Design brief:
- The structure is cut from a larger assembly and holds 1 copy of chain A, 1 copy of chain B, 2 copies of chain C, 1 copy of chain D and 1 copy of chain E.
- By secondary structure, chain A is low in regular secondary structure.
- A two-stranded antiparallel ribbon of chain C has the order 1-2.
- The longest helix of chain C is centred in the C-terminal third of the chain and has 11 residues.
- The N and C termini of chain C lie far apart (36 Å).
- By secondary structure, chain D is largely without helices or strands.
- By secondary structure, chain E is mostly helical.
- Chain E is 31% helix and 0% strand.
- The radius of gyration of chain E is 30 Å and the shape is extended.
- Chain E starts with 26 loop residues before the first helix and ends with a helix.
- Classes of the chains: A little secondary structure, B mainly alpha, C alpha+beta, D little secondary structure, E mainly alpha.
- Chains in contact: A-D, A-E, B-C, B-F, C-F, D-E.
- At the A-E interface, helix 3 and strand 4 of A face helix 6 of E.
- The structure holds 5 RNA strands.
- Chain A: One of its GO terms (cellular component) is cytosolic ribosome.
- Chain A: One of its GO terms (biological process) is cytoplasmic translation.
- Chain A: Keywords: Ribonucleoprotein, Ribosomal protein.
- Chain A: GO terms for molecular function: structural constituent of ribosome.
- Chain A: This is Large ribosomal subunit protein uL15.
Chain lengths: 149, 134, 49, 62, 210, 49
RNA sequence: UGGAGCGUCAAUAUUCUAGUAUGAGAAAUUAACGAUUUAAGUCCUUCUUAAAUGAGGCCAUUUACCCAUAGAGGGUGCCAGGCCCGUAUAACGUUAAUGAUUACUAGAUGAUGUUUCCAAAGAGUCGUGUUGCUUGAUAGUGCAGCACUAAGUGGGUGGUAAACUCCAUCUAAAACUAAAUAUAACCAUGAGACCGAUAGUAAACAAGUACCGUGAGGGAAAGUUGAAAAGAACUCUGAAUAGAGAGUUAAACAGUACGUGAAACUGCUUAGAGGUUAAGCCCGAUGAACCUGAAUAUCCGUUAUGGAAAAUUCAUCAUUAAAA
RNA sequence: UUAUUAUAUGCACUUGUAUGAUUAACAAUGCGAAAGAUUCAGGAUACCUUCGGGACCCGUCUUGAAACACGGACCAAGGAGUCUAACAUAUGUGCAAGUUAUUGGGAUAUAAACCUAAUAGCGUAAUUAACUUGACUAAUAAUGGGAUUAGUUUUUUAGCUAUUUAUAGCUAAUUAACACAAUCCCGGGGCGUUCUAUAUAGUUAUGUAUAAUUAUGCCUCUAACUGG
RNA sequence: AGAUCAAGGUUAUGAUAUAAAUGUCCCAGUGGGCCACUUUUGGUAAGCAGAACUGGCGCUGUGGGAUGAACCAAACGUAAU
RNA sequence: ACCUAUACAUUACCGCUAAAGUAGAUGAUUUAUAUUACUUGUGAUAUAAAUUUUGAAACUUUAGUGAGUAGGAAGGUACAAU
RNA sequence: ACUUGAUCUCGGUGUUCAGUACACACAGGGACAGCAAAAGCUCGGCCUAUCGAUCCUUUUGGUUUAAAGAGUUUUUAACAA
């Protein structure tokens, strides 16, 4: 299924030692099978290129379950693409019968972080969580970061 | 869409008339509208209505019926068929070549078309000659 | 840009029938790019099934 | 080119060629105070290249 | 050997070549399984083609609070709470499975009203065609009314996208909901050590009487 | 891999191509979210360029 | 994940369900299977002269002999839709399954709340200790052996051992059970970017054969005359298989190494030559032999000038009709 | 003043010299010759004949092979860098904060193609051993800022071709502006760890003040929170 | 030590530019060397042993030294002069 | 004096490497001549004849230049199938 | 004479160098100190040797984080030297 003329064997055939050397022939396994031995005769290769192999840092959690750390993330950077931008122009006349209502857990997200630099309208954000800067940089604009259940 | 340069880079190499022959670096089209039979870009089946050629006859020897391009009344989405028109000069072996320069002025094939009608009129002739030697 | 650009495709019927009053417009796939390099690369692969 | 063939009143820009994350790994001696260049791990966690040669307790700090 | 590449872990040391599965009959198991559904939907009846009723919402964990485990039960209170016929529900095709110990009012209602939506569209063939207690009809016998055996029995499937553009637009939005979270966590952190302090404050005064 | 088989549309075949691959103006209805591909060069006639 | 009876409320009870006979349907449907029909040219000329399946021809029907829901495949002296078996649609046929009604068989009135009434439930087993194997299973994941050996608001589990308070969750130590799932074997089929007789199975064939080993076991080689045997009569010579004539075929340069028939190696003929690098060989030439390629409108011009023929949308031509 | 040199040769017309990698004029020889067929040149094609010159046997390992190194008598068939899995880079292609039917389902013409719901991977946000925590003063900003910047706008100046002397192109002199990409410096944030400020007052609520969890006062025992 | 202004002539030895600068693939091979001038250590010496510099051989044919891996000339597309 | 290399040099040819040029052909360009604006003089117009495609993946111009194992890259070439 | 700087902390440099790690050394910032009237000097030995990963065991440190149904205590583990 792979175009063989561009493979080297179509081309190296036939000069004699097939690209692998007269002195230092292509033998079976001249260094070790696999990660042998990254602690004796491959150690330079294993630190560089992978510092941190060969130890134990520690706290064992027998049977981690991947729900107790779920918490999907969203910054204030989006937050307003979740309502339409075509529903951003109308509150940008200016006219504030709004903040809107954003229910970030109905979308998929829990943690509202604060990267952001979001506009001067208020928002009403029902998410399950907070950043310190998500609470500030919303309530400065008027609205409120609110707890989803 | 349709332009003779987009049409040609699709056709340039994967053609069905181009039939290159074995040393000669990439030429020959066996087209019915080529008149200098290589494959250039502007000797070609469809180059979109610069498509003139020179055909005999049907009656050998007098004619050369000339399929003149059937032009820009056509897209050339086809025509309730028109697009080959076949005005065929006759009757004088070296007057009609003036009457082909006189006919068309599409100055790109012009000296390579009456270069062909001559080379048909060179060929259809030789019946009552090449005889006796008594 | 256009979708129209040659915007009348006549319909024909069994007796070679140029004439209808039905003249439908060129349906705008026919301006989209011809790319034989991607067609050949989808064809290479899809007929391996 | 049919409008500005010479390019009068145009702004010819290009996004960053090393924006991408293949470029994050070029090139790596741990032992210099400036590498910061992203190994080829399979997965992010503890017990994945995080122990000996990264921490001053286990082994050394790179 | 050589280079900066990604320590390998391919698990090919165990005479694996005798464990290989082909998948070349992926297509004619799709064809087998489909010709059986056609076979089985005709060998029922006008009866629905899937077809049980399959209750729930509320898949368990915190990821899927909402996207269903696929409802085995209908948990006999929901039958008894919905006008049937607990043994009888099985004879229709309601799938009565008596292992679920319904833990909510609202989950019990969610399926009771599901058991009222269907059973209001569930047409009933009579037995002896006198039909003293129908409750639906015999002129809504399926030839007259439906005869459909339509294909899916849908689950009403989960709105939440949304976004419903509202004014609340609060006045008492002066309340520090980021710090209720910091206050809630330590409340749950120090339950016991407050309760130990709620022992010495309940016992140091008993050293005053003696 | 070779584009352009000689093709014959019937009438109600031809009148559906503005739905399948939708149009230049609007997307398609029969292919969810599909949007006709845009060429790298819209005018594509060099000899008039 | 329990019940049994009572009160009890509601509905209701010539009744339906299950089953065997059941002719359902004036054979009715559906499915299997063998079927069963070949639809349509062996129509005319050419090469084979050994054979057309090839090659050319067949009014028109906007040009195609005919059929085509049948241009899958195979057989036929060469490449066959129309020669033949089939193929497509189907009929035809025997099977089966859907039992309408009727009979006997056998069973059966609840579901509904309530609090009354007795409201149980698997031990040398669980579990602990220890040992051994085992697992991702970690102060034990499973399993087993041995000493110990239970309880009944009990007992198990709740990925960190331990007491103590609770919470959550199921009911061990007894029994069944279709479907999805698996399939180098067995019956019966259809395929393929596979191999093409040193390949593919070892084996395309009298192949697990011939042979070898005391045994266990081991294990080959081996396809092709031609369309048809028309398989060479007969004659001569021989002691003879055989040779030489003859015969057969399109062909014996297809005669049982039977299609092709390569190389290696060589008997014979013809050519030239021979005491040195052993021979080969490179480069320049050579004798012999064979061979390949070769040219027409001008100096100090595609100029001066006379003869014929035919003919013309050409003229100074003119109208006219188009189609671009 | 003695000399010297250049400029002041248009119109025609030559077979003239030069210069377009400066070879061409004159003759001789011989007819592509209808099929038929000679002349002149050439042919180490692949050999034989005659001489001269050169010329060690290949493959291999090796510092070094013609080697008194190993394999090879010769010939035909066979005969050795592959499938897979997972990465990484480069290039091609599709879509782009996304993308990816393919486990399945549906349509259905047939192990294809088409269509498609719920997910799911990977990406979009990270860092801690962990619990915590979670990305620029700000409704705006590409390492914020700084250099070195290709390029577009722009400055006036003589100025160049055209000039109507309008309008271009040109160099720059040179003004200003944004400065893409890339690298080089200085920052700033997230998280971690550490020092340090709090002597802390104080910032918000429980509490507290009252009414009736509730209402409002306000101190702050308490928790939260600010700081370099 | 810096951030913005002011002044600065003709850009501050010579000769060079077969293009230089920079990433990635740290991709192939290699990680047995031998020879030589001058320097040099061990050995009595060695066509021995071990180092420093430059150039070669390895990988390299051709001319010369009758002969030769390194010597002296010279580095190699096919040809004429 | 003279002989002698695959060196030096000048030329033909092959490749490489590095530059440079060409695409309005219902256009460009000749040669004449009729007319002409006329600027004396040279252009513009009509006629008659003539030349003027290239797989632009092409064509044209110019200069330097050529050792090679192990080894890498490009372009061809044989075999068989879809 | 008097002393504990033979201390505590954060990075950086020299050497070995692959320009990796230990180890030794050095130039500093922070803190706490010693001697000295002060300036100053001291981060062991006047300078060039006097040394040792992972895993495991261990101890000292937080007034620590975790044992994933919930509380407290034992225990085990983690992190730093």
């Amino acid at each position: 299924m792979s175009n063989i003329k561009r493979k080297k064997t179509r081309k190296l055939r036939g000069h004699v030692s097939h690209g692998h050397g007269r002195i230092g022939k292509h033998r079976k396994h001249p260094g070790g099978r696999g990660n042998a031995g990254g602690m004796h005769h491959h150690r330079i290769n294993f630190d560089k290129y992978h510092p941190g192999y060969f130890g134990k840092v520690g706290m064992r959690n027998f049977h981690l379950r991947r729900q107790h750390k779920f918490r999907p993330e969203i910054n204030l950077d989006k937050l307003w693409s979740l309502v339409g931008a075509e529903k951003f122009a109308e509150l940008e006349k200016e006219k504030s019968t709004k903040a809107p209502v954003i229910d970030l857990v109905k979308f998929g997200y829990y943690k509202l972080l604060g990267r952001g630099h979001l506009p001067a309208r208020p928002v009403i954000v029902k998410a399950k969580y907070f950043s310190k800067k998500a609470e500030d940089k919303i309530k400065k604009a008027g609205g409120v970061c609110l707890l989803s259940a | 869409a349709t332009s003779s340069h987009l049409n040609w880079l699709i056709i340039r190499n994967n053609n069905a008339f181009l039939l290159k022959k074995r040393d000669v670096k990439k030429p020959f089209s066996t087209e019915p509208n080529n008149l200098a039979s290589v494959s250039s870009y502007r000797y070609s089946g469809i180059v979109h209505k610069k498509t003139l050629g020179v055909v005999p006859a049907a009656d050998k020897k007098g004619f050369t019926a000339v399929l003149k391009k059937g032009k820009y009344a056509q897209r050339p989405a086809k025509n309730t068929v028109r697009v080959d028109f076949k005005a065929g000069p006759r009757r004088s072996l070296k007057k009609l070549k003036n009457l082909l320069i006189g006919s068309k002025y599409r100055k790109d094939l012009t000296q390579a078309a009456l270069r062909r009608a001559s080379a048909v009129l060179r060929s259809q002739k030789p019946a009552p000659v090449k005889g006796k030697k008594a | 840009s256009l979708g129209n650009a040659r915007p009348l495709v006549s319909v024909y019927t069994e007796k070679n029938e140029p004439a209808k009053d039905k003249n439908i417009c060129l349906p705008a796939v026919f301006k989209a790019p011809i790319r034989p390099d991607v067609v050949n690369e989808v064809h290479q692969l899809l007929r391996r099934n | 080119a049919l409008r500005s063939p010479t390019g009068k009143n145009t702004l010819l820009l290009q996004g960053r060629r090393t924006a991408r994350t293949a470029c994050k790994h070029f090139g790596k001696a741990p032992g210099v105070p400036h590498s910061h260049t992203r190994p080829y791990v399979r997965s992010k966690g503890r017990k994945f290249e995080r122990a000996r040669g990264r921490r001053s307790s286990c082994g050394y700090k790179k | 050997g050589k280079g900066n590449n990604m320590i390998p872990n391919q698990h090919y040391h165990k005479w694996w070549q005798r464990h290989v599965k082909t998948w070349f009959n992926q297509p004619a198991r799709k064809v087998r399984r489909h010709a059986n559904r056609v076979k089985k939907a005709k060998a029922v009846f006008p009866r629905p083609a899937s077809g049980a009723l399959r209750p729930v919402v509320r898949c368990p964990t915190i990821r899927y609070h909402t996207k269903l485990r696929a409802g085995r039960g209908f948990t006999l209170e929901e039958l008894k709470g919905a006008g049937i016929g607990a043994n009888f529900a099985k004879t229709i095709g309601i799938a009565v499975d008596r292992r679920r110990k319904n833990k909510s009012l609202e989950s019990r209602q969610r399926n009771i009203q599901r058991l009222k939506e269907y059973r209001s569209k569930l047409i009933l063939f009579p037995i002896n065609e006198k039909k003293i207690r129908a409750g639906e009809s015999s002129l809504e016998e399926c030839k007259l009314a439906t005869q459909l055996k339509g294909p899916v029995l849908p689950i009403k499937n989960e709105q939440p996208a949304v976004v419903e553009f509202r004014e609340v637009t609060k006045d008492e939005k002066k309340f520090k909901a980021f710090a209720t979270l910091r206050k809630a966590r330590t409340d749950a952190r120090l339950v016991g050590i407050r309760a130990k302090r709620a022992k010495e404050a309940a016992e140091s005064e008993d050293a005053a009487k003696g | 891999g070779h584009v352009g088989r000689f093709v014959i549309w019937t009438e109600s075949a031809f009148a559906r191509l503005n739905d399948l691959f939708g149009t230049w103006k609007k997307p398609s209805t029969l292919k969810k979210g599909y949007n006709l591909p845009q060429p790298k060069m819209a005018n594509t006639d060099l000899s008039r360029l």
